[PDB]
Amino acid sequence: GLLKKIKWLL
Ligand SMILES: CCCCCCCCCCCCOP(=O)([O-])OCC[N+](C)(C)C
Ligand SMILES: CCCCCCCCCCCCOP(=O)([O-])OCC[N+](C)(C)C
Ligand SMILES: CCCCCCCCCCCCOP(=O)([O-])OCC[N+](C)(C)C
Ligand SMILES: CCCCCCCCCCCCOP(=O)([O-])OCC[N+](C)(C)C
Ligand SMILES: CCCCCCCCCCCCOP(=O)([O-])OCC[N+](C)(C)C
Ligand SMILES: CCCCCCCCCCCCOP(=O)([O-])OCC[N+](C)(C)C
Ligand SMILES: CCCCCCCCCCCCOP(=O)([O-])OCC[N+](C)(C)C
Ligand SMILES: CCCCCCCCCCCCOP(=O)([O-])OCC[N+](C)(C)C
Ligand SMILES: CCCCCCCCCCCCOP(=O)([O-])OCC[N+](C)(C)C
Ligand SMILES: CCCCCCCCCCCCOP(=O)([O-])OCC[N+](C)(C)C
Ligand SMILES: CCCCCCCCCCCCOP(=O)([O-])OCC[N+](C)(C)C
Ligand SMILES: CCCCCCCCCCCCOP(=O)([O-])OCC[N+](C)(C)C
């Protein structure tokens, strides 16, 4: 999921 990748960046 895309949000999980954002979460990973942040
Ligand atoms: C107006 C604001 C726009 C902000 C845009 C920010 C960039 C977003 C980049 C998102 C990249 C991640 O995509 P993803 O889930 O791996 O893609 C789906 C890939 N498959 C179909 C193979 C599963
Ligand atoms: C309504 C539009 C808002 C736009 C502004 C951006 C807000 C981003 C907030 C993102 C907060 C992180 O959420 P999360 O803990 O992973 O999600 C919990 C729910 N699920 C488990 C189903 C994913
Ligand atoms: C779905 C797209 C998401 C894009 C990413 C958005 C990230 C937004 C992060 C917002 C975090 C808010 O932190 P807060 O509690 O107010 O602390 C901040 C406190 N100071 C100002 C003193 C440093
Ligand atoms: C901002 C933070 C939100 C946190 C909650 C995330 C919940 C994720 C739910 C995921 C399912 C939502 O699929 P939808 O939009 O109906 O798909 C429509 C797709 N097409 C346009 C290709 C048909
Ligand atoms: C308006 C400008 C928009 C620019 C958007 C450019 C696309 C960005 C896609 C970012 C995808 C990041 O997540 P991921 O590939 O799962 O991370 C894997 C881990 N590393 C990042 C350390 C390699
Ligand atoms: C995924 C990494 C990015 C995280 C982005 C965090 C955005 C914070 C927005 C704070 C301002 C809006 O306050 P609220 O309506 O009570 O916010 C509820 C937000 N959460 C569901 C995440 C608790
Ligand atoms: C796939 C989603 C793409 C959209 C992401 C939206 C979030 C805002 C852009 C963040 C992209 C850069 O993050 P990064 O330099 O790796 O982390 C921040 C730097 N530290 C790790 C040192 C804290
Ligand atoms: C609307 C604007 C949306 C912008 C979304 C941008 C998402 C892509 C961020 C790419 C920023 C460049 O990362 P880099 O130095 O090559 O990776 C450093 C990664 N670590 C910190 C984990 C080591
Ligand atoms: C649609 C246009 C939106 C423009 C605004 C985007 C705001 C993005 C705010 C990005 C806030 C950066 O937080 P950060 O230091 O990486 O936090 C996480 C720190 N740790 C990794 C140590 C937990
Ligand atoms: C970009 C900032 C990432 C901060 C990461 C460090 C966590 C501690 C600071 C929490 C600040 C308030 O966060 P909130 O409104 O309850 O959202 C929570 C959304 N995440 C669960 C995805 C973080
Ligand atoms: C090619 C695409 C380019 C996308 C560019 C995305 C930019 C994302 C910005 C991420 C900012 C993360 O802040 P940081 O490293 O933890 O600094 C925080 C340091 N102070 C507390 C002293 C201010
Ligand atoms: C007119 C309305 C104006 C509202 C303006 C709101 C500005 C909020 C600024 C929020 C800056 C985000 O936090 P930061 O410094 O990147 O820390 C990221 C890491 N922590 C969440 C743990 C602190």
Q: What is the DSSP string of 1-10?
A: -HHHHHHHH-
Is 2 close to ligand 10, i.e. is its CB under 6 Å away? no
Q: Which ligand has the shortest distance to the CA of 2?
A: 1
Give 10 Cα–ligand 9 centroid separation in angstroms: 6
Q: Please tell me whether residue 10 adopts helix, strand or coil conformation.
A: coil
Q: What is the spatial distance between Cα 10 and Cα 3, in angstroms, rounded to a whole number?
A: 10
**Which residue is closest in CA terms to ligand 7's atom 23?**
10
Is 3 close to ligand 10, i.e. is its CB under 6 Å away? no
Q: What approach was used to elucidate this structure?
A: NMR
